[PDB]
Design a protein around this ligand. Sequence first.
Ligand SMILES: CC(=O)SCCNC(=O)CCNC(=O)[C@H](O)C(C)(C)COP(=O)(O)OP(=O)(O)OC[C@H]1O[C@@H](n2cnc3c(N)ncnc32)[C@H](O)[C@@H]1OP(=O)(O)O
Ligand SMILES: CC(=O)SCCNC(=O)CCNC(=O)[C@H](O)C(C)(C)COP(=O)(O)OP(=O)(O)OC[C@H]1O[C@@H](n2cnc3c(N)ncnc32)[C@H](O)[C@@H]1OP(=O)(O)O
Lengths: 351, 354
Amino acid sequence: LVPRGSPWFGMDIGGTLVKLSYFEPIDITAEEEQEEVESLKSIRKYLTSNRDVHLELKDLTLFGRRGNLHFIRFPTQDLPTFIQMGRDKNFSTLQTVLCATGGGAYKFEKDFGNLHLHKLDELDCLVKGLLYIDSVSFNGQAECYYFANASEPERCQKMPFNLDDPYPLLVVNIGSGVSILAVHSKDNYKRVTGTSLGGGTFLGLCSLLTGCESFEEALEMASKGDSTQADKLVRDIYGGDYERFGLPGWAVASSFGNMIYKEKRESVSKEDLARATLVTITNNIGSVARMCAVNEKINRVVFVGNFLRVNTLSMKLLAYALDYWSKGQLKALFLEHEGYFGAVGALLGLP
Amino acid sequence: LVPRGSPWFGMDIGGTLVKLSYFEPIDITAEEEQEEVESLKSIRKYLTSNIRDVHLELKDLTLFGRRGNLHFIRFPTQDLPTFIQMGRDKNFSTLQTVLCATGGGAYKFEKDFIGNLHLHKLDELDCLVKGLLYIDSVSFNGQAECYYFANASEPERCQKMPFNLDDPYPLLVVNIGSGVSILAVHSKDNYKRVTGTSLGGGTFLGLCSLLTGCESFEEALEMASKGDSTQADKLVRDIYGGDYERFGLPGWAVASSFGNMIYKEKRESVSKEDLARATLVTITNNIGSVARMCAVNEKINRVVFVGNFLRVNTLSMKLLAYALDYWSKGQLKALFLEHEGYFGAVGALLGLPN
Ligand SMILES: CC(=O)SCCNC(=O)CCNC(=O)[C@H](O)C(C)(C)COP(=O)(O)OP(=O)(O)OC[C@H]1O[C@@H](n2cnc3c(N)ncnc32)[C@H](O)[C@@H]1OP(=O)(O)O
Ligand SMILES: CC(=O)SCCNC(=O)CCNC(=O)[C@H](O)C(C)(C)COP(=O)(O)OP(=O)(O)OC[C@H]1O[C@@H](n2cnc3c(N)ncnc32)[C@H](O)[C@@H]1OP(=O)(O)O
């Protein structure tokens, strides 16, 4: 079960960006393969012309062969150039069909000449790519990490986590919405639940509330804001902690709850509203993930998805939230190769 | 244990209104008690001067061994000192020494109790629980105190039906005020707050006020009732063109709350009513999921929803019914109680000094 063509690559075609993973063999005996390798290098330098280099996995064994696994991203605008480069450099894999995942794949097959697309499922690719990368480690170092002292986001530090045996695992996938997968083995996983309150809710609400024009700007606003200007805290109701039920005064009682008062709405800043939106969304995800972890009886919770790809702020709030709801019993886990699991899953589905 | 005082009443003192329950005994042998019953009627008529509550009156129930009627009234906090003075002038022994009340406004009221009454503050959630469990135990004049919505998956068509909740335990109580507390009730004297969510009624009103400029909870609900959430939300069909077959999601399910609002074109055409509806759907869908997950983790299959989020339009109740039905795949029915609003006051009555 080794792919038919060469070179071996996997692609995840987004609306804006393609994530591509490709394998560079290192035991080369033929003139043709040596020029394939050189062509891949030249193609890579061109497509990434305007971090991923540092993701390269060196000397791994894939389908019985030694090589380096590379990870690149480029605009979907230039995917025709990638395909043509492949045809001109006589790549057997860019002739017969194209096997890709991602939200832009079907669209791309319509935009694009002669090409037949074999479309792969993003969640199936995600799980396969995630398990494989975890199985090979990150050049002998930790693929997985968490934030120590998660209850203090201004002070938490990144620490390696051993996920050498990944099973069972809960995967919390945060895109526009949130899907939660329980993974029991390579061949046994399902979407156990989800929430429609995801990164699209964060960005949607920020756009409406603040007039921001991108995920990047919304997160920058949030990074500068104070959510407690919008949120009603337990101390706002009780004058301190809610003793009887042991809710601390600093817990959020009602997200956006102070915005019911005309005077509070008049003085709240755009940045406070952006932060309150983010905090509402990340605290809520940490609650759903914790309850799923309890019900599924799984104590390893990994977070992936495009929501995490810009600021480390999203991740730190998720770490804080999971620690809060679990009373310190669960650590939010994150993965270095996040963003490339679909591409890697697509590569592994080549055969 | 029976309360020491006569007459028996309980109050929940809010920031603007007081909710009072009082017991009118049926079997009177002493003239002073007859005069007490006549006083309460006159007091009730005064305070409610200037019909839903009358219809709530529970007739011929048994409280602390005595047959009687339990009355429910609401009146401005502005007139609470009058009520206290009325009781003191009519010689009520329950207004002689100490007044035990619940409600966020009880402490503000403290100085008026000009006078020699100590305020003993009771906890609102403890009162809610004691009140709720007692009212379920007696019924609504035979009629059902508890109801659900049949065909909950179709909020346009769902029908309010009686639900027999005779043996309450165990019960999950989802209390929706500004935020959400969830209590697992195992028996009358063993319950705990098992979790909560900060996305409650205050989130709905707060976001609505920001998004649409509505001025009140009543107005936000009115707007939401006319709106279409699917104008703001991104559905599974918007992502896949239809169902997402492989992972058990129908095309009509919400993929991303407010998710279409990332598009300028969509933001410019969405109505205030649609934004109000999407806010409400987002909150009710999320509470449904939390409630369902709690039910399964606590192994409880009766989930009751209470709190001020429910008191203004039937819409929020039907949407919660809808959400719980969705997440439980029809295995849980959302339950509601007719005397919601007064459980605090009833729990305070039950907490009279004995
Ligand atoms: C009654 C009620 O409705 S309560 C609400 C119940 N609803 C739910 O439980 C649904 C919650 N939501 C979800 O599970 C998710 O939103 C899903 C699964 C429906 C969609 O997944 P999302 O992560 O939101 O998709 P989003 O459009 O942000 O895209 C994220 C990734 O998927 C890929 N993708 C998007 N669409 C497709 C597609 N049609 N085919 C293949 N891949 C796709 C993207 O390219 C992107 O990939 P990347 O992370 O590798 O860059
Ligand atoms: C990291 C994170 O923070 S994740 C977030 C975690 N947060 C949580 O779990 C908390 C979520 N929130 C909650 O549980 C609730 O909001 C609480 C319990 C804190 C407050 O309860 P709410 O229902 O929101 O209070 P709200 O002010 O809306 O009042 C509701 C009722 O309680 C009563 N009440 C309010 N304050 C008080 C008070 N101080 N004393 C007595 N009664 C009170 C009101 O009078 C009102 O009475 P009614 O039901 O008869 O009308």
